[PDB]
Amino acid sequence: HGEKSQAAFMRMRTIHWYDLSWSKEKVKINETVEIKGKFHVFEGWPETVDEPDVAFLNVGMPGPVFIRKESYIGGQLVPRSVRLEIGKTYDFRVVLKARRPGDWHVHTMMNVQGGGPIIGPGKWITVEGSMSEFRNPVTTLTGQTVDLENYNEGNTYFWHAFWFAIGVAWIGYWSRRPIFIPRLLMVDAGRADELVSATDRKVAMGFLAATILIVVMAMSSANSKYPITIPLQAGTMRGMKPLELPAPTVSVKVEDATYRVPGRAMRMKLTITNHGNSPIRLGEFYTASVRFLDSDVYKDTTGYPEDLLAEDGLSVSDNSPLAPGETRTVDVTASDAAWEVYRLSDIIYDPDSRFAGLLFFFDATGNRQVVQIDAPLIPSFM
Amino acid sequence: HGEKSQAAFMRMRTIHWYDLSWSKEKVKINETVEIKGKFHVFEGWPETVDEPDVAFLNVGMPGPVFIRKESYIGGQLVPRSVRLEIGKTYDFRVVLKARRPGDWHVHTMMNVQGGGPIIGPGKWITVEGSMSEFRNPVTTLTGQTVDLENYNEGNTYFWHAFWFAIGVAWIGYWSRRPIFIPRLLMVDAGRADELVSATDRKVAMGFLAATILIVVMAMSSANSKYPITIPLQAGTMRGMKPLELPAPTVSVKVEDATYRVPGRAMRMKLTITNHGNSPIRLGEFYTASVRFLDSDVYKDTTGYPEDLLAEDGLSVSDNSPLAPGETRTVDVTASDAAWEVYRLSDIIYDPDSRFAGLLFFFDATGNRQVVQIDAPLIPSFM
Amino acid sequence: LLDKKWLTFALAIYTVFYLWVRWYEGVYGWSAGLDSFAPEFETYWMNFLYTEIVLEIVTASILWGYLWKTRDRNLAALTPREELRRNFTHLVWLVAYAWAIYWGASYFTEQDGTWHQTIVRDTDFTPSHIIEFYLSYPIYIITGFAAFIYAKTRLPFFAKGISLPYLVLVVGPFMILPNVLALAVMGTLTQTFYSFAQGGLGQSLCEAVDEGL
Ligand code: CUA
Ligand code: CUA
Ligand SMILES: [Cu+2]
Ligand SMILES: [Cu+2]
Ligand SMILES: [Zn+2]
Ligand SMILES: [Zn+2]
Ligand SMILES: [Zn+2]
């Protein structure tokens, strides 16, 4: 929710999410659900999106229907913003605790610095149970174990009510008397200054001194309990460990790529050329969270969101094994309602008709090669 | 035109252009001329020139005496801005169609983002024929083939005249009556409001309604014809393919480098040391578009602009073959009027007396090694 | 008698001069005016500069000098009959100003605008700079002053004063410079209008409105 309305080429050429997995589809309150995967920051990052020098690994949901217990880019826990580097692939892991009963479309998203929430695929997860069951316990370096759901709640309230009351008390003191039309006219013809006088100005400095007094008393009383406190921990984490990917064995070349307007399909003419040594076939074209597969070749088992998985969405003019050393040109068609439903079709309103995706190739014994393609994508109407 | 006046060191240490070639020196209206070559973004890019994160491959001419039909950096067509990367070398190719008869000094230039047009060498090309002969045909994805020279011209004109006339019509209507000194005085002593009244205010809303009406009618009439339209395509192209250069086999070291003030020559004391295995000689020093050659060693054939080519401009104290494994210190002098004509001599006014060039070495069978030098260049007056 | 085609001078004097200029650059824009480091620039274009600056200081000194001395000393008593003739000539000066501004602020300005798009500048002294800044602007400023002074020295109402809007109108250009407000004219018309109607209130102008017109 929130992708779809954002520019189709940003969605294509910004971050690619793959090897996504969700530990659970249905979950009880207080239970854990773990999201894993990889993302690539596209080498051809658009203009116009500040490079992800300060990015944040977020979660796309309707507020705290879950809470984020942990998050990890590379091996590292990531509660700050992190510097990601264009071109690199990373593995992430988000760990959610369930908090509100319902049906939630949970996404994994990146937050970028200068302009943009970069929203990955969303999967529906269901939380059963009562919100009154939810606990967020946390042990401090100070001994105590508290519940973050309610920690410091009453304190917060008290101080607010107390100070609010005093606010009222002060206006209340002055409003025993008549407030406007008499006081206004006294000021007018002739002098005011009959309107105020100690005992008024005693009360004035009563309040004034009492206020300063209570603040300092309260503060060094608050310092007395809670003598051990740190400042908010902040600051972008550099040195994110990227994934070391083997150099791919297939290389592809995109000669023209077109889409029908209106339509539900993108054609592209690829010259796939198989270096390395096992007969290779094309199994998937991933484009903007939308996955087009040739079921002749590959079948998702990870339960990828049903609306984004095009089971036999991908057709190759010739998808026989491509022998090692051999190179062929092939016409490929990615085709599925998702192309219209997730509005990739809206690329026609974009000021940069260029797409970008990942192709996944599979050899005989089922091990894979990931090449990335990008190219201009040109409309055809007639 | 427009180099010369720009800072001599900017010109030395910004972009190096070499292997320039021009397919023709004289050309008929509507004919093509193709510019090719290579450029290196200098590693020691000055301060003060924004790195070429957003640069544009332009052409240096007096307006559209030619039109740029095509431009290529690496393999890719480059109608947008492009991100070039410091240190790297690229090959470009501009393709020009002739449009205005005459003698044009065409340059190949870079347009950089934050301060600077980076102007390459300019070569004189002559166009013969009549401007009335020029055509710029283009076929749309919409069926129609149009001439860009005049496409939509009449339309533009109509709508401007029409609206312009209506503007006049409005002032016209009011100016049938006297305009200033009576209307001014009426306002003064006593009230105005005799000055205007329906039928005036009928015409007022006549115009007002007529205008909104014609705009919306016109718009959805313009939408009826031309139902297929895109937004301006824009946005910096990343991922420019740089050129894969073999590591050079010669390495040079610049110990002192001086120029006479005033003068036409720059001396430098190089320690050339020939790794790799064929007796090597020095054949050229390229500096700021100006190319200095040892004609005992190398001869331009590409027809490099005559004012920038110093045929035997370059003299080496000892330019015998430098044996492989051997290493020697040599005194080199680049000398030619071009040094004063293109104002490299104006380095004496620059806040950064450092030069930068390319040296070209040639072995016995005539294959070449390019090393780049830069160093401080110091004046000598006495 | 009344207001002559001494006006036709004012309109054609710029028109001819500036049309000669537009020809002159038209032929030497290309030829000399491209490469400033060629000696044909230091003759057809640089000499042009020195010539004009000198001619401007001179004509300015003569033109303002003239009028300030021929300032009408016995202004106190001169007829409404001429308080009109003069008011009209003043208006000719304003037409000359406005015309002069047109050329400077619209014509040669947006021309220089095109010139920048088509050649990278070799100097702060391009042809269109020699013409836009150091010919066009001084001219309309000189015209400006002339008018101002004429009014101050020739018409009561304007004498004993220094009109604000008019001063602002005339010196305003001195605080307009580029990289890397002239609406005052209104105030100054609403003035010159009143200036016209001292005896010339009558009217018309309140009489022959309440009748024919
Ligand atoms: Cu938000 Cu699915
Ligand atoms: Cu233009 Cu040399
Ligand atoms: Cu990617
Ligand atoms: Cu270089
Ligand atoms: Zn299931
Ligand atoms: Zn030649
Ligand atoms: Zn200018």
Side-chain angles (χ1 to χ4, degrees), chain C residues 4 52 54 56 61 89 97 133 138 147 187 206:
Chain C
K4 43 187 143 42
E52 78 200 5
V54 167
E56 294 153 5
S61 304
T89 321
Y97 190 45
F133 293 139
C206 278

Side-chain angles (χ1 to χ4, degrees), chain A residues 28 43 58 88 98 128 131 135 138 159 178 276-277 297 337 361:
Chain A
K28 253 132 206 196
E43 289 86 6
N58 219 1
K88 298 285 140 171
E128 294 201 341
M131 172 141 157
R135 310 285 187 258
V138 72
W159 283 112
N277 45 26
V297 168
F361 289 92

Side-chain angles (χ1 to χ4, degrees), chain C:
Chain C
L1 269 55
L2 201 51
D3 154 337
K4 43 187 143 42
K5 70 170 199 163
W6 169 239
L7 152 78
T8 309
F9 184 77
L11 281 202
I13 186 62
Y14 297 100
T15 303
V16 183
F17 181 85
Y18 282 136
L19 262 154
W20 171 80
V21 178
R22 174 76 185 94
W23 164 76
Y24 178 100
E25 64 182 327
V27 66
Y28 311 119
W30 311 262
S31 291
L34 293 164
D35 202 72
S36 68
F37 292 116
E40 304 129 341
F41 195 82
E42 283 133 44
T43 62
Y44 292 53
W45 281 117
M46 275 302 191
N47 285 168
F48 193 103
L49 183 78
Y50 311 99
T51 298
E52 78 200 5
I53 311 272
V54 167
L55 278 188
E56 294 153 5
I57 296 170
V58 165
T59 30
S61 304
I62 286 164
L63 203 267
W64 308 333
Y66 190 138
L67 305 160
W68 179 247
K69 245 123 205 180
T70 66
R71 137 206 36 171
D72 196 18
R73 189 73 77 269
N74 202 346
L75 198 45
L78 275 184
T79 42
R81 301 178 185 264
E82 251 164 316
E83 210 201 78
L84 212 80
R85 265 175 200 162
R86 281 175 180 194
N87 252 327
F88 260 121
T89 321
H90 173 67
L91 189 50
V92 192
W93 272 118
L94 262 47
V95 150
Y97 190 45
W99 194 224
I101 276 162
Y102 162 70
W103 285 105
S106 181
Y107 193 79
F108 293 108
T109 289
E110 215 170 73
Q111 185 195 60
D112 167 61
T114 90
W115 201 248
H116 273 256
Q117 313 297 346
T118 81
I119 3 156
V120 196
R121 344 164 323 104
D122 264 335
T123 36
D124 311 286
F125 294 114
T126 46
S128 64
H129 275 211
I130 317 285
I131 299 136
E132 185 202 21
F133 293 139
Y134 317 104
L135 175 66
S136 198
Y137 289 18
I139 281 167
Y140 86 85
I141 289 155
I142 298 156
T143 313
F145 273 78
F148 182 96
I149 306 151
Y150 184 87
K152 213 276 176 301
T153 52
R154 223 105 341 192
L155 286 27
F157 185 79
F158 285 126
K160 204 175 187 184
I162 301 178
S163 163
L164 185 47
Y166 205 16
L167 179 64
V168 177
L169 176 76
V170 145
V171 310
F174 276 85
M175 308 173 279
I176 68 85
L177 333 130
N179 343 289
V180 77
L181 188 29
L183 293 183
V185 88
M186 290 172 303
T188 116
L189 279 192
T190 152
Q191 286 186 2
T192 61
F193 285 157
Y194 287 136
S195 178
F196 264 90
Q198 310 263 249
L201 261 157
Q203 247 158 307
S204 181
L205 326 162
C206 278
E207 276 172 44
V209 196
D210 289 40
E211 341 165 355
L213 180 77

Side-chain angles (χ1 to χ4, degrees), chain A residues 1-3 60-62 104-107 119-124 307 342:
Chain A
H1 304 45
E3 78 269 49
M61 64 196 144
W104 313 116
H105 212 162
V106 192
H107 297 254
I119 304 174
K123 171 158 212 172
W124 291 101
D307 61 327
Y342 276 69

